[PDB]
Design a protein around this ligand. Sequence first.
Ligand SMILES: [Cl-]
Ligand SMILES: [Cl-]
Ligand SMILES: [Cl-]
Ligand SMILES: [Cl-]
Ligand SMILES: [Cl-]
Ligand SMILES: [Cl-]
Ligand SMILES: [K+]
Ligand SMILES: [K+]
Ligand SMILES: [Mg+2]
Ligand SMILES: [Mg+2]
Ligand SMILES: [Mg+2]
Ligand SMILES: [Mg+2]
Ligand SMILES: [Mg+2]
Ligand SMILES: [Mg+2]
Ligand SMILES: [Mg+2]
Ligand SMILES: [Mg+2]
Ligand SMILES: [Mg+2]
Ligand SMILES: [Mg+2]
Ligand SMILES: [Mg+2]
Ligand SMILES: [Mg+2]
Ligand SMILES: [Mg+2]
Ligand SMILES: [Mg+2]
Ligand SMILES: [Mg+2]
Ligand SMILES: [Mg+2]
Ligand SMILES: [Mg+2]
Ligand SMILES: [Mg+2]
Ligand SMILES: [Mg+2]
Ligand SMILES: [Mg+2]
Ligand SMILES: [Mg+2]
Ligand SMILES: [Mg+2]
Ligand SMILES: [Mg+2]
Ligand SMILES: [Mg+2]
Ligand code: NA
Ligand code: NA
Ligand code: NA
Ligand code: NA
Ligand code: NA
Ligand code: NA
Ligand code: NA
Ligand code: NA
Ligand code: NA
Ligand code: NA
Ligand code: NA
Ligand code: NA
Ligand code: NA
Ligand code: NA
Ligand code: NA
Ligand code: NA
Ligand code: NA
Ligand code: NA
Ligand code: NA
Ligand code: NA
Ligand code: NA
Ligand SMILES: [Sr+2]
Ligand SMILES: [Sr+2]
Ligand SMILES: [Sr+2]
Ligand SMILES: [Sr+2]
Ligand SMILES: [Sr+2]
Ligand SMILES: [Sr+2]
Ligand SMILES: [Sr+2]
Ligand SMILES: [Sr+2]
Ligand SMILES: [Sr+2]
Ligand SMILES: [Sr+2]
Ligand SMILES: [Sr+2]
Ligand SMILES: [Sr+2]
Ligand SMILES: [Sr+2]
Ligand SMILES: [Sr+2]
Ligand SMILES: [Sr+2]
Ligand SMILES: [Sr+2]
Ligand SMILES: [Sr+2]
Ligand SMILES: [Sr+2]
Ligand SMILES: [Sr+2]
Ligand SMILES: [Sr+2]
Ligand SMILES: [Sr+2]
Ligand SMILES: [Sr+2]
Ligand SMILES: [Sr+2]
Ligand SMILES: [Sr+2]
Ligand SMILES: [Sr+2]
Ligand SMILES: [Sr+2]
Lengths: 95, 186, 92, 160, 154
Amino acid sequence: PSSNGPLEGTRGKLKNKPRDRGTSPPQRAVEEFDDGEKVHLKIDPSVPNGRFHPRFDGQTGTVEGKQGDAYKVDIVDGGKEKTIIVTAAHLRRQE
Amino acid sequence: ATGPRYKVPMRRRREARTDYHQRLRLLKSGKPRLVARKSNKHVRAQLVTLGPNGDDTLASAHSSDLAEYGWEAPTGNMPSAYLTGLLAGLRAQEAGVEEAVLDIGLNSPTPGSKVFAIQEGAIDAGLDIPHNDDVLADWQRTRGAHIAEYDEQLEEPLYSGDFDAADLPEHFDELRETLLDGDIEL
Amino acid sequence: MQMPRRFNTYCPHCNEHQEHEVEKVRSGRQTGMKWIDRQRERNSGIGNDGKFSKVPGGDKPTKKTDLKYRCGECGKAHLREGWRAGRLEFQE
Amino acid sequence: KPASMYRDIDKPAYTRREYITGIPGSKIAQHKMGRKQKDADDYPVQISLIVEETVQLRHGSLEASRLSANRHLIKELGEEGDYKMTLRKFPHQVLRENKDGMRAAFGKIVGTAARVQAGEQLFTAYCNVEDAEHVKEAFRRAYNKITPSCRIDSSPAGNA
Amino acid sequence: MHALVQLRGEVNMHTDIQDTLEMLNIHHVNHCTLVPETDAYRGMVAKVNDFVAFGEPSQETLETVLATRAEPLEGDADVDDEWVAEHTDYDDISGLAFALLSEETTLREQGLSPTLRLHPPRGGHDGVKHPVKEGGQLGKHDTEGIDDLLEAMR
RNA sequence: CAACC
RNA sequence: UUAGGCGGCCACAGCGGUGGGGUUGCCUCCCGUACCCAUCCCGAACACGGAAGAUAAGCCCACCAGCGUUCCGGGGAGUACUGGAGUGCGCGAGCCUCUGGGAAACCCGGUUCGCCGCCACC
RNA sequence: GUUUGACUGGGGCGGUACGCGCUCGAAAAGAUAUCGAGCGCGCCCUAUGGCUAUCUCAGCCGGGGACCCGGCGAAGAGUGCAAGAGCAAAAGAUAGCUUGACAGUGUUCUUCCCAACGAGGAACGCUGACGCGAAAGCGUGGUCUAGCGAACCAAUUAGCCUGCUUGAUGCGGGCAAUUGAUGACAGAAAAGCUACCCUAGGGAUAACAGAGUCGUCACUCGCAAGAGCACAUAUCGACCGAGUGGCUUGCUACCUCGAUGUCGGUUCCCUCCAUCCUGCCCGUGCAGAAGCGGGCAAGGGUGAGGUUGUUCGCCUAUUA
RNA sequence: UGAGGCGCCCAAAAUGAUCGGGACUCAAAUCCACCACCGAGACCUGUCCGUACCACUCAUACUGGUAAUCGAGUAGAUUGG
RNA sequence: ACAGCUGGUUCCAAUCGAAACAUGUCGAAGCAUGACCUCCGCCGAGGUAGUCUGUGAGGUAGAGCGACCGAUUGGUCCUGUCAAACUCCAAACUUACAGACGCCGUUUGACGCGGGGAUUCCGGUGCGCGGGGUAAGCCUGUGUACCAGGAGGGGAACAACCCAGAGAUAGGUUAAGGUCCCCAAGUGUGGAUUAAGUGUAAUCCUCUGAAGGUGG
Ligand SMILES: [Cl-]
Ligand SMILES: [Cl-]
Ligand SMILES: [Cl-]
Ligand SMILES: [Cl-]
Ligand SMILES: [Cl-]
Ligand SMILES: [Cl-]
Ligand SMILES: [K+]
Ligand SMILES: [K+]
Ligand SMILES: [Mg+2]
Ligand SMILES: [Mg+2]
Ligand SMILES: [Mg+2]
Ligand SMILES: [Mg+2]
Ligand SMILES: [Mg+2]
Ligand SMILES: [Mg+2]
Ligand SMILES: [Mg+2]
Ligand SMILES: [Mg+2]
Ligand SMILES: [Mg+2]
Ligand SMILES: [Mg+2]
Ligand SMILES: [Mg+2]
Ligand SMILES: [Mg+2]
Ligand SMILES: [Mg+2]
Ligand SMILES: [Mg+2]
Ligand SMILES: [Mg+2]
Ligand SMILES: [Mg+2]
Ligand SMILES: [Mg+2]
Ligand SMILES: [Mg+2]
Ligand SMILES: [Mg+2]
Ligand SMILES: [Mg+2]
Ligand SMILES: [Mg+2]
Ligand SMILES: [Mg+2]
Ligand SMILES: [Mg+2]
Ligand SMILES: [Mg+2]
Ligand code: NA
Ligand code: NA
Ligand code: NA
Ligand code: NA
Ligand code: NA
Ligand code: NA
Ligand code: NA
Ligand code: NA
Ligand code: NA
Ligand code: NA
Ligand code: NA
Ligand code: NA
Ligand code: NA
Ligand code: NA
Ligand code: NA
Ligand code: NA
Ligand code: NA
Ligand code: NA
Ligand code: NA
Ligand code: NA
Ligand code: NA
Ligand SMILES: [Sr+2]
Ligand SMILES: [Sr+2]
Ligand SMILES: [Sr+2]
Ligand SMILES: [Sr+2]
Ligand SMILES: [Sr+2]
Ligand SMILES: [Sr+2]
Ligand SMILES: [Sr+2]
Ligand SMILES: [Sr+2]
Ligand SMILES: [Sr+2]
Ligand SMILES: [Sr+2]
Ligand SMILES: [Sr+2]
Ligand SMILES: [Sr+2]
Ligand SMILES: [Sr+2]
Ligand SMILES: [Sr+2]
Ligand SMILES: [Sr+2]
Ligand SMILES: [Sr+2]
Ligand SMILES: [Sr+2]
Ligand SMILES: [Sr+2]
Ligand SMILES: [Sr+2]
Ligand SMILES: [Sr+2]
Ligand SMILES: [Sr+2]
Ligand SMILES: [Sr+2]
Ligand SMILES: [Sr+2]
Ligand SMILES: [Sr+2]
Ligand SMILES: [Sr+2]
Ligand SMILES: [Sr+2]
């Protein structure tokens, strides 16, 4: 890459398909998840805050608690364990 | 409508019925919502909770079923609104609901209005709802005094159908008196 | 940029919000009696004097704000992080 | 410059004019020849020159092959003969040349070419049964001025 | 039930392809194994298609190979009808062959090594640079084709 | 053209 | 749901169009500014108070496909492209065979003029 | 007495790909290079920050390129600055109010994929004190990704700890943190010449030559516009297209730096043919003589002189 | 008049020509099929060795057992002689 | 004297077996910290190199643009073309998590954890995908297998092309490749084409042969 900021090369993954453009439905931004639950991580282009590092888009982690209204989700980046702080708006239950 | 790339607003947005930005902020409380609404002739109060396939109304009261307890007056005024809230509130307490946040939909936060009267009603019913006293109409107006004095400037009865000539806020009292009572069939 | 001479903000001393007056930190005069001053005299002799032969460094294109925030009631000041500002003029 | 330098599709598509400046003008004078006021449907015969290999054809080559082809048609049918020929491809691919050894080698812009897949029609003519052999001859001269071997394919024409 | 025989060595073959063979219990050239026809196993053979020969053998062929190359989980003990009867849920090789082909059991389940260590093909095979349809020995074979191979390697 | 420009 | 409120999905719901529906019921349009409240000027709106009138808007009900959208059949197409393999072909750029996957445009015929959840209600 | 850096299709010169951000390169998870393509940042802003209320923008049309009215108009506007991305009862506009651009202390991620590493950054908490709002709630600066700096030292902020037997005063030492810069940007205080040179090594790296390449150069072929008084092809021959050679030049850095002596000439030997003469032919815009062009053909020949170190070339008299 | 196969022209280089050479023409060439063979340290098989593990054992001493799923190796780590 | 530079450093065997890369560095002929190799100790039941299925991530190939965007023809709706920094579409495929099967681990203790010792930070080649360059046995990426550090068989010779991964010794059968002689095996069978010694040349710096032409 020519630069190394957090959004380097995120044109596609952080862009909305035209029809999904615009403020997102509040339901998923308020969804509640329980510890142990499997949740897919996917940033919602329309939602500014509560995001995780774009590099983690597509991970399926495990909720292990929360910090304020955000969730602490455990993942394994390659071989290393990491805890991700992320709000419901960027999460989806697995299955 | 124009083409593949065209963006159509969410249905409740087209219909101009749901303010999604206010809704989200409302839902962030984690508490149920005291949905206060109005019609030209009626006033409705619902205690709504979030659900998997949509909202869930746990309790509610309409100004119409107010007569069901001895109401012969119109159903689109302050006294009606307050009592309707209280009724809904009481029923809310029945179903186990103890707290709520006022959702006034697309209505304006005008001081002394009816959605605020509905709130004062629901609060007296025993429901804990974040509010602000100096935004609620003064007691007398809730009773319906403002309308009695309006009938003072008579010459021609304010109410077409005969409910009375000089109207009665004292009736408001009898009804609230009846609602705060235990017996009452909710 | 412009900066209000006085404004309401948190006073970590009163532990409550109060009016403060903002002032640029004026350099205090040295005494020439600090340990470094004596080391300079003790270690400078014939020839090069190591660190005491080095001269003043350069300058950053822009400096960060350097202000004092004085509480309008208890009279005590506190410091804050500064932010790069080409110029800082006060209003009133 | 030899065509061996650019005839192959061995580089990314380089056509974005918003990021490329100093692009030389095309040498192609016309893409529609003959009586262009008339429709191709008004003719009983349609013959195309098909490219047999995938290649890049520099605008200098298109002009020469088109020229030597239309020129023949004009000589054999007249400056206003009853026919119409079309060059359907345009030189969208920008070409470079590195003209300092291999250091900072990205070349300066020197021309344009059209990419043609094998089997595609480069030229297509429409004529009457009479001037059918005249167009087949105009094409024989045209494929002699472009890299690949070509097929002179006759579409509508059962007058054999 | 398909019979799998590795015909191309490990040198230069993709590691994921090589690990697949090993999971199918084949660790040497000419080694053969029997695999049930499941969606899971199907992907595995499809992935190793270019380095093996496979197909469904006939009852008679399986019986010939089992008699000649079947081995105990441990030991040199011969595997004959008597061994089969005294150690498996069958009375003789045939009973075993049938149960295998009908996928009701596995060599391991009956105390036998999952692998049949065949002999090089008598008279040579059709070549390991082309598939069957092109005259080679690689890929899915005919029951008659697989039988010709398995018998030449008895 | 045989180093440096 | 003989017309209501809060929604979930967020065009299969859009755009456009036709037909039908309401004496003390519902939603409205509607009537009206003493009050609470309101217009940088307007009771237009917001807000309050109310029933003389109306089903013409809205709304709800039934429906039409011309445009847009969703899915499906048949054709394009097992084509384009492609993971694995090859002492197969080609001067070469490149192509082919076997194995496992597999579009897009477009055309023709259907589908689609919302589905679902909670509450309330002749 | 020393320093005078690093990168680099050898070095110098030129440049900075030496710290940051965006698109593409990048091959649909992540990561990914070149002196790769396009281009930015070292700020600016007391509002251009924050909240609330009211509200909807470009552009086009119709009625009285400023203003007023209506219609269409999901976004092409606006949002400080690159690029890409986000945003419409708003994240934009207007109005009003306000100072959360706040103090303390963490969690996590990033910096640095995987996988250790500082400053810096972000998201998300708890505590304190506040702003606005009916309230939910929003505010840890500007919608998101650039706008940044170690130790030592100084100045500064509030309280406290401490200085050699002891008390007082002076003046010091310290805990926490803010500001001052190192852009060679994970931080030395720093100019050149050497042909008088020296050492260590390198074919890890240039010059001659070799080798690869063949853009360049040489030669050939295809097509044949054109002219040749008429006539493409006696002859000359543009454009474009396809090749062969390895004589020039360029490129690469494969071989050799414990050395393969460097231009020109000379002398002596072998060879190639794309043939200058000689032999034999074909055509002619072939009367002859002689030209011009072409074919086979490498047996033999291809010489002497003037300037110049010259190669080449220019010049002279001879010559088949 | 269309298409396919093989070949021909296009086709010039330096000490001595070349498909490795000889040499080959209903082939010892090319294409389509087929038959039988040759040919590794691979694979199968006998015996032995090392190493790992197992049983027995104080033993890492003997004896017995298992290895389809053990046996190549530069820098380097480890251990017995 | 010092050197980060060249040279050298002496007995046998057994187990395992790299890195030629990332971050920082007055650093690029060096180091440190990681990655990776190895040894020891702790832990005690799972693990996941393969495949299938389910729940997700993705915009490359292709395609297309009366779907944006910007290029790009002509005529009096039609008609002619495109995109590394375009997208109404959209693969193969790569990838997170889980279940199933497979394989493996519970005396061979896997997975994980702590500690000792390194070496290494000039790489190269093939194939696929690339970016630069007319090109190169070119430069610079990426994934993978190989050489390096890999024998033996074949390929005339020939680091990385084919077979093949190998304890000793012995018998046997094949692999690649080959069967006229040199040289082990056919002057094999059915059939057809070629007259040029075309050809007897998988791959390749290495094996050329093109546009164009041909009543062979
Ligand atoms: Cl994160
Ligand atoms: Cl309402
Ligand atoms: Cl300042
Ligand atoms: Cl020993
Ligand atoms: Cl091995
Ligand atoms: Cl010969
Ligand atoms: K020199
Ligand atoms: K040298
Ligand atoms: Mg992309
Ligand atoms: Mg065994
Ligand atoms: Mg063979
Ligand atoms: Mg009507
Ligand atoms: Mg070839
Ligand atoms: Mg010194
Ligand atoms: Mg240097
Ligand atoms: Mg990627
Ligand atoms: Mg210093
Ligand atoms: Mg200071
Ligand atoms: Mg640095
Ligand atoms: Mg850095
Ligand atoms: Mg020296
Ligand atoms: Mg070299
Ligand atoms: Mg010598
Ligand atoms: Mg000649
Ligand atoms: Mg001679
Ligand atoms: Mg044999
Ligand atoms: Mg040893
Ligand atoms: Mg030993
Ligand atoms: Mg494409
Ligand atoms: Mg080595
Ligand atoms: Mg012999
Ligand atoms: Mg030959
Ligand atoms: Na959205
Ligand atoms: Na001293
Ligand atoms: Na340069
Ligand atoms: Na109506
Ligand atoms: Na320096
Ligand atoms: Na940090
Ligand atoms: Na050269
Ligand atoms: Na050449
Ligand atoms: Na000389
Ligand atoms: Na001669
Ligand atoms: Na001379
Ligand atoms: Na070793
Ligand atoms: Na030194
Ligand atoms: Na390296
Ligand atoms: Na380095
Ligand atoms: Na060094
Ligand atoms: Na398992
Ligand atoms: Na492709
Ligand atoms: Na290896
Ligand atoms: Na050999
Ligand atoms: Na020959
Ligand atoms: Sr001193
Ligand atoms: Sr001094
Ligand atoms: Sr400066
Ligand atoms: Sr290229
Ligand atoms: Sr051609
Ligand atoms: Sr009115
Ligand atoms: Sr060629
Ligand atoms: Sr299929
Ligand atoms: Sr000096
Ligand atoms: Sr140079
Ligand atoms: Sr923000
Ligand atoms: Sr100077
Ligand atoms: Sr001199
Ligand atoms: Sr030497
Ligand atoms: Sr000759
Ligand atoms: Sr002559
Ligand atoms: Sr000269
Ligand atoms: Sr060994
Ligand atoms: Sr070994
Ligand atoms: Sr090993
Ligand atoms: Sr990829
Ligand atoms: Sr024969
Ligand atoms: Sr024959
Ligand atoms: Sr060579
Ligand atoms: Sr070749
Ligand atoms: Sr040809």
